[PDB]
Structures are given as C-alpha cells and as structure tokens.
Amino acid sequence: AGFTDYKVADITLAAWGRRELIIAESEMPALMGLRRKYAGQQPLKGAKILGCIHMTIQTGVLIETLVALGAEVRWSSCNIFSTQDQAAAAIAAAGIPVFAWKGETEEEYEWCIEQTILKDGQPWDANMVLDDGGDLTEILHKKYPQMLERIHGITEETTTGVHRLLDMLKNGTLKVPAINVNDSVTKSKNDNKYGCRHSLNDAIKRGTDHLLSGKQALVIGYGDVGKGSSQSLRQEGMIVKVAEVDPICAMQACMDGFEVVSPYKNGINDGTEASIDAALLGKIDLIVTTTGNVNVCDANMLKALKKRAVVCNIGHFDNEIDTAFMRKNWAWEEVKPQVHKIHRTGKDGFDAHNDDYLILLAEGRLVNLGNATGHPSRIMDGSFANQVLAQIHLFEQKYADLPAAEKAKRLSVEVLPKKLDEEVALEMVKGFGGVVTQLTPKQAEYIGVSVEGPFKPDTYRY
Amino acid sequence: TPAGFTDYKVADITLAAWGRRELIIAESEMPALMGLRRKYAGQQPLKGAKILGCIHMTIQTGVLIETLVALGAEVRWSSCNIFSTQDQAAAAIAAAGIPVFAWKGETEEEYEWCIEQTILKDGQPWDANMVLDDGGDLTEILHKKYPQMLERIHGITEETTTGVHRLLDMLKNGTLKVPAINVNDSVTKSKNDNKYGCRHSLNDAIKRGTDHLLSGKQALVIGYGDVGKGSSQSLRQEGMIVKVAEVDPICAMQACMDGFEVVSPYKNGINDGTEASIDAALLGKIDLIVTTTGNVNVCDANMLKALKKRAVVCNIGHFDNEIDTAFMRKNWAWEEVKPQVHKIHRTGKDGFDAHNDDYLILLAEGRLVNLGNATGHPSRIMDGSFANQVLAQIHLFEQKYADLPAAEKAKRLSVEVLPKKLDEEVALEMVKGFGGVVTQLTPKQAEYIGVSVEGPFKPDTYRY
Amino acid sequence: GFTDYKVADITLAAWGRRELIIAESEMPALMGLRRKYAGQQPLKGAKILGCIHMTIQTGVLIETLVALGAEVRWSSCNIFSTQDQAAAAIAAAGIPVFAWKGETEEEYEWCIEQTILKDGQPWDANMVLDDGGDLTEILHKKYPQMLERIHGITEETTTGVHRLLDMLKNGTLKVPAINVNDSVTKSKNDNKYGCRHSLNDAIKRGTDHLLSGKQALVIGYGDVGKGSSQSLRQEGMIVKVAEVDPICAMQACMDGFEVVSPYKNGINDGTEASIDAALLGKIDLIVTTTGNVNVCDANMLKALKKRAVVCNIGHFDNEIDTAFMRKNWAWEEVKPQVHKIHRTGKDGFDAHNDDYLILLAEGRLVNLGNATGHPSRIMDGSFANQVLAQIHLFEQKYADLPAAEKAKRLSVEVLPKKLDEEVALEMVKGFGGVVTQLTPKQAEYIGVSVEGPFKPDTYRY
Amino acid sequence: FTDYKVADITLAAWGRRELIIAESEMPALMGLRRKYAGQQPLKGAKILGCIHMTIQTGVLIETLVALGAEVRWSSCNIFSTQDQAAAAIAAAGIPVFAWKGETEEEYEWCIEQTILKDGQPWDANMVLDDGGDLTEILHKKYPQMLERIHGITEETTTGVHRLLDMLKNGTLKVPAINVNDSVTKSKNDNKYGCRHSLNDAIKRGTDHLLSGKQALVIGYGDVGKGSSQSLRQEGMIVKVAEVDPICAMQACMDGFEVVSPYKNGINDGTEASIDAALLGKIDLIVTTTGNVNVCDANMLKALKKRAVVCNIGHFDNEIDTAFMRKNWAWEEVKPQVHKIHRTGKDGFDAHNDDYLILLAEGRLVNLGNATGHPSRIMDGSFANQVLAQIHLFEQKYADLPAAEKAKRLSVEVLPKKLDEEVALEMVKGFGGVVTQLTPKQAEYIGVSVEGPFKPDTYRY
Ligand SMILES: NC(=O)c1ccc[n+]([C@@H]2O[C@H](COP(=O)([O-])OP(=O)(O)OC[C@H]3O[C@@H](n4cnc5c(N)ncnc54)[C@H](O)[C@@H]3O)[C@@H](O)[C@H]2O)c1
Ligand SMILES: NC(=O)c1ccc[n+]([C@@H]2O[C@H](COP(=O)([O-])OP(=O)(O)OC[C@H]3O[C@@H](n4cnc5c(N)ncnc54)[C@H](O)[C@@H]3O)[C@@H](O)[C@H]2O)c1
Ligand SMILES: NC(=O)c1ccc[n+]([C@@H]2O[C@H](COP(=O)([O-])OP(=O)(O)OC[C@H]3O[C@@H](n4cnc5c(N)ncnc54)[C@H](O)[C@@H]3O)[C@@H](O)[C@H]2O)c1
Ligand SMILES: NC(=O)c1ccc[n+]([C@@H]2O[C@H](COP(=O)([O-])OP(=O)(O)OC[C@H]3O[C@@H](n4cnc5c(N)ncnc54)[C@H](O)[C@@H]3O)[C@@H](O)[C@H]2O)c1
Ligand SMILES: Nc1ncnc2[nH]cnc12
Ligand SMILES: Nc1ncnc2[nH]cnc12
Ligand SMILES: [K+]
Ligand SMILES: [K+]
Ligand SMILES: [K+]
Ligand SMILES: [K+]
C-alpha cells in the first residue's frame, strides 16, 4: 500500500491482532454503540489526534472508533512495557501511524512520542491530544508551544496525568483546555478499581505462578487502585494489610475488613533504618504500591522485606519503588521478561542458589500491563467511551479558533456532564444483560429528577 | 437523678440501670465521639445551647445526647421512628434528668405527641435555639406549626439522606428559615453509616425477626445507593443469591461489577400500572425483598401479589411508604407472630386459616427494619456519624445565625457540609479505635502530590 | 388436666405454636418424613427419652416422632438453650417436657430425671435420643435395669459420639447407637453451616458489637471451627485460627486464614511466659470450637486485650477456664447471658473500670445461649436423620434379641449413604434446586446406579 | 545425552531458574529430599512416570532421583507440558519425552519412549501415573513388563476409578496406592488448585472480564467446588449443576443456585428437554465431573452467543467436541483458543457473531491455557507421591511368593500419620504455628499428642 509511517515489533502479527480486536468489539458495547451512533454524523471529521496511551487491544478499539468517527491519529504507548505487539501490528496494517512495542528503552519511548508529533520531520497539523499520564502533554508544552496554539484540547486518562494538568493550570502554564476523563464514575470507579481487581492477581500469576492463598500481602495505598488491588489479593485468600496516609481511606480499609498498618513505627518515616517495622516487613510475601506518590516502598523497606517476597507497582510511574537503590546495590537475575530476582547479597554477581532475593515485576513499571494485558475490554469500554465523548466535546468547542478574550473564559480542566456518564453506564449494564427500571413520573417527581436522568446531584460520591 | 424529675415519657424506667451499663460499653466503642467529649468539655462550647433533638432513641443516640450535655447543652429529645427506640436507652437518659419522650412501639398519634413534648415545656414553647434532626420530621413540624420558634434557632443539623433532600427542597422553594448542615454527606457518615451500618444490621434484623436461614435463598434488593450497597452485601455475605434493581445506570453498573445480576420487577423495566407488566416469573422465585431507595412505592401492590409464597418483605429506607403496606392492610389478613413480625395472608381480608400456606412475612410493618427488628447500626459505626453531629452543632451554635441582622441572614441561609479536614480528623479517631496506624507523609512526598502533611489529602471532588 | 411437665410459662404456648407452623414450612425433609410415614406409624410402641436443646426446631422433631406413633419425655441438654415458647407449645400439646431457659445445674439434672421417672418409678422407655451424652451417661451409671429394655441410642453431636465410642472401647456401652452426627447432611450442614449462621448472630444479640475490622481468634478448625471462622470473616473480621491438627491447619491456610498459636512455638507448658502476649493483646474476640478442655485457659484470659469478647460454641463450657474467672475476678451482669469480668480483683468492681472481658452465656454454647441456635432449614437435615435413626434402631429391637445376637449388634454405626442422599435431595428441593438425572450411559461410565448412591463410602465431600 | 525429545533444549536455563524458585515453594517435597537423602530409599528403583511435564513435576522428578531412582518420563496430556520444564529435565540427563502441543499419535509415541529403551522394554520396576493411560498401556500391550513392577502410584480421581475397575475385574496385576485420596492431595490439589488455576486459564486465553457475567459449573465435587469458587471470587454469578444431591446441598449452602441444563433434570436426548432459557443466559460453562458428555450437543446449540466453553476434568469427552468438529467451523484465535462458528461447517464469516469460544480444545483448561496448579499446592500431592513410591518399592511385590502376592494385590491409601506430616510441612511453609496438645488434653479427646488426631472416617 506504500504505508511505512509506523514502527512496531512485528507487522506479521497483524492478523492475530485483528482477530482479538474483533473479539474485543463484542466486549465493548458502549464504545461500539458510539461508533454506530456517530458514524453518519462524522463528528471528528477534521480532527487530528496525537494519542499517547498503552497500545493494547483495548486501545486499538478506541483508535478505530476515533477513526470511524472521522479523525486522523498518530499514536504511541505511554509505557515501555504495556504494548501488546499484535495490537500495534493490527493498527499499523490498517494504515494508522503507530510507534509502539513491548520492551522499549527509555530512548525509544521518547523517540516514539516524537514520531507522532513530527511527520516528515516537521510538526504534524495536530489539533487534539489524547494522553494517559501527561508525558505527551508535557513534551508539547516544553518543546512545541507553537503546536499548542492550534490544538483545541487535551483528554487525559489517568489520575497522575490529571494532577499534572491541575499543576499547570495553577501555575498558569496550561495552554489548552482539558477534560479530566479519569473522574467520570464509569472511569474512576470502574477502570481504576475493578480493572485492577481483575488484572493485578492476573499479572502476579503470569509472572511468578505463585499461590496467593494463605500468604501475607501489604498494599500501600487505598484509593481507587488500592481498593481494587486489595480486593484482587483478598479474593484469592491473601491476608492483606493496607497502608495509607489519608485517614478516611484508612477508615474504609478497616470497615472493608483489612488491618491497617504502616511500614514505619507509629507511621513516622524519618529516613532511618530504626524507623522501619522490621517485624512487620519480615512477614510480608507481597508488597504492591498503588499511590501515584514517590518512594512509598523505599530502600530501607526493601532491605527489611521477607526473603523471596514479590515487589510490584501498579501506579502510573515506577518511582513508587526505589528501584534505583536496587540497581546500585544488588545483583539482578532475569528469570524471564519482566521478572527479575534481586539478590541482596551484593552488586557483583550472585549465587544461583542464593535464598536472599526479592522478585521484582516489570522492573517496577505498571505491573498489570507489564506482566499481563492490563484491564479487560469490558472494563476499558467505559473509560474509552468517555474518551471518545471527551474528544467530541473539545473538538466541537474549537478553542484554538476562539478570540483571546473567549479563550480566557474556557481555559479549564473539566469533567463530562453526569448525563453522559450515566449514558455510558447504561450501555455497560446492557452489556451484562442488566435491566434498569424506569421511574414513574410520580417517582421521578418525588426524588426530584427527570425520568431520563441525571439521577444524582453532582456532589454524589457513589 | 434530679429530685422529683417527671419531664419525660418512656416505657419502663426500671430498665435504666441496664441502659447505663450498655452506655458505658458503648462509650468504649465510640472513640471519636468520646474524644470530642474529652477535648471540649473544659471549653464548654455548647454552653447556652438548647437543642431540640429527633433521632432514634438508641444506646448510640444516648452517647450522643450525653456528649452534647457534657459540652454544656440542654436538650429535649424524641425518636424519629415509632419502632426504633431501645427502651433501656430511653430509660437511662430519663433517669439522668434529661427530658426524653420515646418508646418502642409508638402509635402515629403518640409519635407526634412525643415530638411536641420536646417542643413545649410547661405548656409553652421551650426557648430552643438548636435543632438536631434525622429525616426532617421535627424540622417540618417547627416550620409548619411553630414558625415563631425558628426566629430564635441558629441552625439545624440533619442526619440522613431523606432529611437532606427535604431541606434542599425547602431551600429551593424559599421556605427554609434557618441554616443547616448536611451531616449525611460527610464521608465518615454516608460511606460508613449508610453503607457499612446496613451491612451489619440488615441480616441482624432479619435473623432476629424470622430466624430464617439466608444462605442459598433468593433476594431482591430494590436500590443500590449507599444503603442498597450495604444491604446487598449484608445478604450476599450470608450466601444469598442477590439480585439488584436500580433506576440509576451508574449504580446498576456498580452492582454488575460487584457480582450481582441487575433485574427489574417490571418487564423491560416499564411499569404500565397493570399486572401484566409484572415479571411474575422473577418475583415468584424471590424469598426476600428489601427496599433501600428513599423513594415511594418501589415494592407495589402488584409486586406483592406476585411474590413467592412465604417471602419476607422489609424496608430499610427511612419511611415505610417504600412498600404499599396500605394495600395489604386494605385487602389481606394480618397475623402477628411476635412484635414487629406479621404474617400477611393473601387469601382474603376477614379471617385467615392458621395453617394457610399463602402468606408473606412483613417486618416492622414496613418501617426501618434494622432499627425495628434489631438495634440499628453498632456503636463503632455510629461513632463517625455522631462525632460529625457534635461538630455540626458546635459550628452552627457558634455562628449565632438567629442573632444576625436581616441582611447578613440572607447571606448565610444555606445547607453546607463540614470541611474535609474535620471529616479526616473523625476518620483518624475511628482508625485508631481499630488499632490502625496511619502513615505520615514526608515533606517531599507531600510536595510531590501537592498536599500538606497534615491534610487535607484529597480535593473536594474526590469520591472515595 | 395435663400436669406432667415443667416449663417457664405455659401462656407462651400460642406464640410457640405460631413459630412451629413457620418452622414446618422451613423443614421439608422432616415434614416429608412426617407425611410419608404417618399412615404406617413406624414408631408405634416407641417410648423415647429425649435430651436435646428445647428449641422451636426440636419442637418440630418431637411432633414428627409423635406423629409417627412414638411417646416421648423430653428435657434440654443445656441450661441456656431452651426457647421457652417452644417448651410451652410442646407442654400445651400434652407432651411431657421439662425445660426452661436459665436452669441451674441442679434443675438441669432434675429435668433429665423427670423424663427417666414417671410417677416416681422408671418409665417404660425403649429408645434414647441424646445430644452430648448426658442422658446416656445417667442411664448407664444410675439406671442399668432400664437399659436392658432400650433398643438403641441416636446421638446428635460430636462430643456425645466420642463418649459412646469410649464406652464401646471399654465394654461399658449397653445398647447400640446410631452416630447421627456423621451423616453429611448433619456434620457438613449443621456443624459447619449452622455455626456460620448463628455465631455472629449470637455475638450481635449479646453485645451489638461491630465485627468488621476487628481481630478474632478461633480455637479449632474442625466442622464447627470452619463454620465459625466463616461466620466472622464474612462480617469482615480479621480472623486467625489455632489448631493442633496439621491437616485442619492446612485447610485454614488455604482458606485464607493466618494460623497462629496462643503459645510461643505452640508449646503449652503451663507458664505465663509461654503466652504470646503480643498476639493475645491484639485479639478483640476469641471463640472456642474444639470439644476439648481448657483451650482458652487462665493465662490466655489474663493476656487478652482489654474489653475482648470471650465465648464458646463447643458442647461444654470447660473449653474456657471460667472457674478461674469465678475464683479471681468480679462478675458484672450486663443482661441475661452477658457478663463483664473485671480483672481488677474479686471484691467488687468500679462501674467505669476499663479492664474487663465480656463473657457470653457464661461460657456455654453461645449460639444457643445468646440467640436461637441453628435455623430451621439447617436443622431440617439433622432431625430428618434423627427420625430415620430412631426408626432404624426401634425396628431392629435389640433389647429383644438373645444374648449371642446382642453381642453381634452392639456397635456405633452411621446411617447408610442412600438415606443421607435422600435427605439431601429434599433439602435441595427446599431451595428450589434442580438435581440432574444421569443417563444410563453416564451411570455406567462412572460406575453408579442412576438412583445412587453416587459416591463410595470413603468419599469426604 | 540424546535419550529424550523436547520442544527446545535451549529453554533449559530458563526452566532451571523456575525450578530453583519452585523448590522454595515446595517445603514438604524438599523436606523429603533432606530427610531421605542419606537413606537413598529409591536406590535401584526404575520408575516409569506419566504426568503433566510441568515445573512442579520437575521438582517431583528430581526428588525421586535425589533419593536414588532412575526414571523415564512423559506427560499425561498433549497440552500440559511446560517446554522449559521438560528442557531442564532433559538437560539434567534424565530421559523425558514431552512438549506442549503434541498430537494424539505423538502422545502415544512419548509414552512408548519411556517404556522402551534401545528398542527393548526397559527394566522398569515402578510406575507413577496420572489418569491411568500408562497403566492401561502396560496391562494391554506390555503385560510381561508388569511381572517386574512392584507397584503403581496413581495421582488423580479418574485414574483411581480405572484402577478400582481393574481390581474388581481381576485384571490388575500389581498393587497400587491411591495418592488422590490423601487429604493433603484431594482436599488441596483437586479443590484449591482449581481455585487458583481456573480463572487464571480463562484470563490468559480470552482476557475476558468475569465479574457480572453468568457461569454454569457442571459438577460440584472437589474440582467443581474449587472451580465454582475461582469464578465466584471474581464476581461471576455462578450456577451449579449436580447429580449428587449431597454435593448439590453443599452448593446451595455455599451460596449457589443449583440448576439443570435439562427441564426437571431429565436428559431424555431431545432438544425439547434442554432448558433453552437458562442456557441462553450463560456466558461461561465449565465441566468438572470426570463423566462423559455433560456438556452435550444440544446444550452447545442452546448456549448464549459468544459463551466460553471449557473443561477442567481429566478427559476431553466431558464436552461433545466431536459434534462441533463434525458440524461447525473452527477459527483459531491463538494456540488453545478456538472460535467455533455455529453458522455451518465449511467456512465462516470473520465477523460472524454466532460463535462459541472453546479453550484447549476441551482438554484440561488449567494446564492447557495456563500452568496448572501452583508449586505450593502441588507440594502436597507430590510429597504423597514420593512417600507412596518409597512404600511400594520397599515392599518389593514383584519379588514375593505367589500366595504372598495374592494377599498384597490391593489399592491402598497412605496412613493418616503421613498425611498429617505432609500437612505440617505445608503449614510451616505459610509461617503457621500448630499448637501442641497437653497430655491431659490428648487424653480428654482420646488421641495421642503425636497424632493421628482424627479417625479414618473423618471427612475434614
Ligand atoms: N495500573 C492501572 O491500570 C491504573 C489504573 C488507574 C490508575 N492508575 C494509577 O495509579 C495511581 C493511583 O491512582 P488512584 O486513582 O488510585 O489515585 P487515588 O488518589 O484515588 O489513590 C492514591 C492513594 O494513595 C494514598 N497514598 C499517597 N501517598 C501514600 C503513602 N506514602 N503511603 C500510603 N498511601 C499513600 C493516597 O492517600 C490515596 O488514597 C495513579 O498513578 C494512577 O494514574 C493505574
Ligand atoms: N435504616 C438505616 O439505618 C438507614 C441509614 C441511612 C439512610 N437510610 C435511608 O435509606 C434511604 C436511602 O439512602 P441512601 O443514602 O442509600 O440514598 P441513595 O441516594 O444513596 O440511594 C437510593 C438509591 O435508590 C435508587 N432508586 C430510587 N428509586 C428507585 C426505584 N424505583 N427502583 C430502584 N432503585 C431506585 C436511586 O437510584 C439511588 O441510587 C433514605 O431514605 C435514607 O434516609 C436508612
Ligand atoms: N454449638 C453448636 O451448634 C454445635 C454444633 C455441632 C457441634 N458442636 C460441638 O462443637 C464441638 C466441636 O465439634 P466438631 O464437629 O467441629 O468437631 P471436630 O472434631 O470436627 O473439630 C474440633 C477441632 O478442634 C481441634 N482442637 C482440639 N484441641 C485443640 C486445641 N487445644 N487447640 C486448637 N484446636 C484444637 C481438633 O483438631 C479438631 O479439628 C463438639 O463439642 C461438638 O459437640 C456444637
Ligand atoms: N484439571 C485439574 O487440575 C484436575 C485436578 C484434579 C482432578 N481433576 C479431574 O477432575 C475430575 C473430577 O475430579 P474430582 O476429584 O472433583 O471428582 P469428584 O468425584 O469429587 O467430583 C465429580 C463430581 O461430578 C458430579 N457429576 C457426575 N456426573 C455429572 C453430571 N452428569 N452432571 C453434573 N454433575 C455430575 C459427581 O456427582 C461428582 O460430585 C476427574 O476427571 C479428575 O481426575 C482435574
Ligand atoms: N488494557 C488497557 N488498555 C489501555 N489502557 C489501559 N489501562 C489499564 N489497562 C489498560
Ligand atoms: N436450633 C437448634 N435446635 C436444636 N439443636 C440445635 N443445635 C444447634 N442449633 C440447634
Ligand atoms: K486486556
Ligand atoms: K446498635
Ligand atoms: K433457630
Ligand atoms: K504452575
């Protein structure tokens, strides 16, 4: 076809990827419903979307939905280990520029993002951004400000990326408006919680094949990811302990039946080894970080962990674990891809039968995507139906074309209206075969809602 | 204790010593509430407060009452439900010299009389200046029947979802006369009391009323809000096969993901009024139906006619009109098994065969079943709710809304929630009561996620 | 003019009858037997001494035995387990019953004796139904001439079966017995799932404590310990399990529980120093489930976290050293079957003392003492087995056999698997469950009959 | 060394890394290595072994070798081998013939390669079997080899049934130990192993969300119990079918609805007997019975579009896959995952929506689409296997006089004391602490402080 504008691991995997895409379409009714609803309208005609998000089968269905609605895209993954190579191949073989493979180096990861930004060595005529984690958003602001003049908006997938957007807005450096896709309930309380419930124990089993029942786990964090992670391990029969800095989230962990503990004596992290609860950490078989924070599994914790404990991170970035300390001081033995034994006996060489090692999964990167396939299609359906609606909304607002006085009034980080959140949810429920009841007019009046919704005030927490 | 004290009405004063024993146990189970008592007793922040209180007269409410008194308040108290009082709790409070008008098993006339006995003292309006309410009934009577009393009242602190809804409707219509705090929507209330409380107390009440095995049987929970979520878990953890109905697709999505089948009592979810719209095949398999919605007529007459023989029917929302019990009083014969447990014989109105097989079992005559057939939420859960109530009372009493000039009053006539910092401090005391240890952020960590080391840790938009 | 009974309050009979009528609808296996055998009257001529918790469920059992032709004289096998409305309804029906909630030990003994004697002389009993062995022991020690005419004993529970097997081992057992406990529709229904239902039930009724998020220690992980551990874990407790049997301990681990010992390295040497004080100081609730003696001992009780709840769901109260607590500590009754035990001394207590334990049912069977025991639909299985066991031994007529034939039949046996399966089928039908029927080819393939039994006798389920 | 056949010998280093890890996960098995290494109780044993050539089986093999045995090994299923485990064993100089993805013919050839060495019957004297295929081949094709064999140790429920049938028929030639019915096997492996590995295999094959979907589990024995839990703990709405009313009672009490694919449970052969409304709602069916044709052709026709079909019993005939080969078009998604298009036999529309997903072609799905049970669970089964091999080999049945052989030809289980000793090592691997009875407490309950703590009739 003459198409060379891509870079994947193995284009010959395209047929396999296409078979899995066709299966995933049947698992994604909200996203496929949007394809059918908007195909004739072509609401993304003229949109040119820079996309940076895990190049999985689920992302493939998202891409082809955007394209079916009229958009053009240039795509990269937002993590070096999260691509499914057959997914990237199917997208490239469909004539869609994608630069992504499993097991990129840091230099290749940056090169891939740059290949979406540049076409034929010059800035692509981008006018929309879809991001997961804020890396593409950051590169555009620091390196390509002239490109942002013509971009109508950013739709950001995940908690960490939203935080970075809010920091830019606070400092007055955000250049285009954004939709916080993370905080739709059909994203945050579906993807972040239930997705990790499905995919955490999945990745741990694929990486180690360890029995989990009867063993001791420590989950650092009890937000949406930490809630789902803790359920992922508890439902397998693990004895799960939970750590938290937010006493409200800790209260939920208690009421949910977990013991709440701190790696530090009386919870005080003063940087000394004496502050580490060695008795507690010496009994832990598995530690999982879920925070989006820095260094919540630190060097002294790693030194105190029970021999042969598994260490992994399911937050967005690998700096939740002090893997730099481990690269500097301990010998790494690869078991298989994305599974390393870290030998605490020294830096130079190891004994093949040493018993004093840790098992690190995905080199500390997002373990569900690194060691398995991330969240399943039916969960990602909710997140990516929101993504498509967010893209439609900002592209139709046409921020880049507004006068400066109107731009100032629209430069914000917003969420989708609750009515749309509900409409995504209903398609998900129908996908399960669920039957929602319709309010009578008197019942709708009694609780103060329209029969068709929205059904809750914007303050409702679900 | 006070000599000659007669300003109360309870079922049995001889239960007071028993009630006091249970209050002393409950104090050990309520560290947030008792922490406020220790912290603020010397300051006496409620000195001069005269609180009208209307909330279920349980042992837990007793600990709330005596905390308010310990901080300087005078109170006059009634229950907000005819079946929810624990008579030993009411007796202990009356024996302490605190005016309380409450017993288990009031008539509706007695229920209204009890509220009016708090409102009046010696035949005339008490000089109340604060209101604590659970469901809005006391709020409604004051606005409807004693509007002049509201000229002296600084605020209302409302406990529960239904009460807040009524307050918001009044605010929208310009009929709310004093500011209010929505205690319900603290996270240490709504996502503790409403959910976890019902998880503890729903299966408790069904067991006490019926002693039915729940494992292996079929349940239908109407609603999947906070109460519906907790109720569904109460039954699923006993091994019930639980189906969930909802009108809200987001809540229905959560029910699916939580492992429940989502179904409607009506074919295709459409109630067209007729019996033909009822999914008779579904309802004929249900052993237990629980209403959790705060809405009206969500278990209606046609559903009751279609239910499986000998199914249990109950309501854990605030008001009994979730179930059309009036239809059942009109058409079917009631056989009392024991207090708050009735067999409802679908064979006819007049008599019943003592061995008739075609009956339903109704708990608490459709009133809040956890309080009607058991003791409601446990002390350690009510700790969170009632710590919020005390902080709410202190805040509004200190604001002195009734002493403001008319212009400044319109600026503060609002329904507010407590700030998140206080929500967190309540949660911290609850966690410590479990022996949990919260970790402290390092300065670099707190900078990294953009919070203070002391909190708050989440933006107000966070849903937990 | 029926006076041959003693209950708390006969005016509770109408209430008891209402609850019996409900329970009948919850007990399809047992009522199925009532309907199937009523015309045949297989227990005509049976005269049954019965000793088992005088609950509503036992009421349905008694009236099934009577409906099948038997006469009975009844007592409870525990001082706190009677439901007074059940005893009243049975008495009001003209059935001799001696039972009330809150008996003294002297009254408990007197109640059993009133079943044994009628008009001051031995009743013409010829069958025994027992739960725990107390009636069986009194007959063997005190009324051997009565045992000469008794055809058999049907024994409900693990502890009573152990006592039977000891008698058989020693050559002191005088009549054959059926071990009803070890039907699968009893042991793996009643002992396990019944305790799942009623343990957290009784703890809530006695204390109204929140259980979610608190620390529990369950002593034992047999059938009762398995059901009890699930009762607490499903409420959200953090449950630790102790065991002496490493196979049961392995099951606890695989079921997601941490297995711990009250004693350092598991060595119970009798010293305070052997107590894992750090462990015991974390426990909010301890439950004993063993059928053994002193598995929650004085040194454990001294080390428990302040305000912990202590209770026992095994047959006898000696699982807990309550005698030590009576001797050393002050007891404050909260309400019936709930006591605070003040560890500050024996001579009085401060009403606001913080150093106390809460003891449920004075250490007696807590599900029956503080609630209503197992629910009717679970007891359906146990009591259908009891009825079938009574029929089997009564029809065998052991007492009428020659001495040489008695020696060949003096044993402790279980009911056959086909009966166990038929009880299970009625239970499943009560839930609306639909069992599949094997085709001839499938039955041939796995080597069973289409009607069962479906498993070899060695199968453990 | 050339006496082996595996997929890729260069995987040996990888397999060896995973064996070193597995050793740390198998305390009972490694404890037997340490305690019997001095005695060498299997010196002189020549063991024919036929069981899934996994990493876990590699630790079993090297334990038998560490205690003195020679072995020749094959897998007992065409899809269960882990190629890196087989390579590590071959690279250790141990004859093994096994790879993932064998044909039926290759599977038989592999068993024959253990039986024969240099074109002649090996001088085998012990048999270790999982499912009875090797046992059957020896009896039917190499009966004279059985005159030198001291015993068989059989792993699984289906193989035990086959052994009992031969004993009843007078065709069993050597004594056997039923390893399945140790509690540390049956009530650990069969139940908890499937709890770990069923949802594992379904995720690896389909990556389907399981929460909120409907499952039908056929059977509720030990495998059906663990399978049902594997699905329910993920949030599936699980229904259970059973022919055994006692097992069905357990399913009800465990919180499951008990249903039959057939109206009133009567499987009369007609489409009319199928409960089409029930089957049309099922997203996943799992067979666990060890029986034949429990997911039959009419059920397959009635299933909800895009339902997943799989089998975790020993043999693939639980599902009528022959019917589907005969009538419907198979589209391979990836190895051991096939879409079966119900539109017809010859060809399919790539976008057809009327298909079912079959995992592992109906073969044991946990080993076919994942890695079977985890090391810490297989520890219990394989410690029992080692002990049973030691017992039968030391009994030396083949060397006994005829009348002594008649008294010794039986199928037995290991004593409870050994069962408990395996369990103790497993418990210690979790860090659990077993309490020791006092002498008074032991006397009170009528046991020895040493145990056994339960009568042989106890069901746990
Ligand atoms: N892997 C996935 O599929 C996936 C999915 C969604 C989100 N994420 C990422 O996971 C991270 C968390 O997301 P979220 O939505 O759960 O955020 P969140 O804000 O809901 O939760 C994070 C939690 O970590 C806690 N925490 C912070 N510092 C801590 C510390 N030092 N010790 C203990 N707890 C601490 C916070 O109190 C908070 O409750 C983000 O990086 C997000 O982008 C990953
Ligand atoms: N008994 C208790 O202890 C207790 C405790 C807290 C609250 N409550 C009461 O329970 C009620 C519910 O409170 P909540 O906090 O859960 O409110 P909520 O708003 O969180 O949930 C109510 C749910 O009912 C659903 N619903 C409404 N009409 C419906 C219908 N026709 N069919 C199906 N679902 C329907 C709504 O969509 C909503 O999700 C209120 O009356 C509240 O005051 C009782
Ligand atoms: N309350 C009820 O409703 C009810 C119901 C059934 C049985 N029971 C009684 O409960 C008791 C147990 O019955 P079961 O069927 O579970 O018996 P079981 O033999 O199955 O289990 C008892 C367990 O206790 C363990 N054990 C013994 N001593 C121990 C110690 N010192 N520390 C820890 N664990 C120890 C044993 O290893 C055994 O596994 C008996 O007294 C029985 O009669 C009560
Ligand atoms: N894949 C694995 O890892 C693994 C592990 C252990 C055993 N197995 C195999 O799994 C199978 C089952 O083993 P088990 O130990 O559970 O045996 P089991 O005897 O304990 O259970 C089989 C159950 O299937 C039921 N059943 C039989 N026919 C039925 C039908 N037509 N419909 C419904 N239910 C029916 C029986 O009543 C029985 O309860 C055997 O083939 C065994 O070898 C596999
Ligand atoms: N499967 C998936 N695809 C894309 N983004 C994801 N985030 C988590 N899981 C994912
Ligand atoms: N309800 C009950 N009736 C009789 N015996 C019992 N044992 C346990 N629960 C019982
Ligand atoms: K996926
Ligand atoms: K209460
Ligand atoms: K009962
Ligand atoms: K494995």
Side-chain angles (χ1 to χ4, degrees), chain A residues 28 33 50 139 151 163 167 172 176 210 222 261 265 299 352 372 376 432 441:
Chain A
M28 300 178 87
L50 297 170
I139 296 169
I151 284 163
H163 176 259
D167 277 343
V176 302
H210 276 356
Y222 207 68
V261 306
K265 297 170 180 183
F432 291 105

Side-chain angles (χ1 to χ4, degrees), chain A residues 183 194 256 262 456 461, chain B residues 185 196 248 258 439 458 463:
Chain A
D183 279 344
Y194 303 126
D256 293 345
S262 182
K456 299 288 186 303
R461 294 190 173 98
Chain B
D185 277 345
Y196 300 128
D248 183 323
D258 291 340
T439 302
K458 299 286 188 304
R463 292 189 177 101

Side-chain angles (χ1 to χ4, degrees), chain D residues 137-148 173:
Chain D
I137 291 166
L138 287 171
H139 278 78
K140 134 195 85 191
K141 190 178 186 174
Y142 301 99
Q144 181 162 357
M145 289 186 61
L146 284 166
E147 301 168 358
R148 303 319 308 154
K173 307 302 275 187

Side-chain angles (χ1 to χ4, degrees), chain D residues 350-418:
Chain D
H351 293 94
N352 170 50
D353 71 330
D354 188 5
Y355 61 87
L356 308 167
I357 298 188
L358 178 66
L359 300 177
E361 306 189 38
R363 276 74 172 165
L364 306 111
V365 65
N366 60 327
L367 289 139
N369 284 92
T371 69
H373 298 357
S375 295
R376 194 165 296 270
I377 283 185
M378 294 308 300
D379 190 36
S381 311
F382 284 173
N384 282 283
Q385 277 287 358
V386 172
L387 289 167
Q389 283 285 316
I390 295 160
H391 182 73
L392 283 181
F393 177 73
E394 293 178 333
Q395 163 173 118
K396 296 287 197 284
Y397 171 92
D399 292 337
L400 294 182
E404 237 127 3
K405 288 175 143 169
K407 288 171 302 191
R408 292 236 153 108
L409 182 50
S410 67
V411 176
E412 291 181 2
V413 296
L414 295 169
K416 182 171 293 305
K417 187 74 180 67
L418 298 189

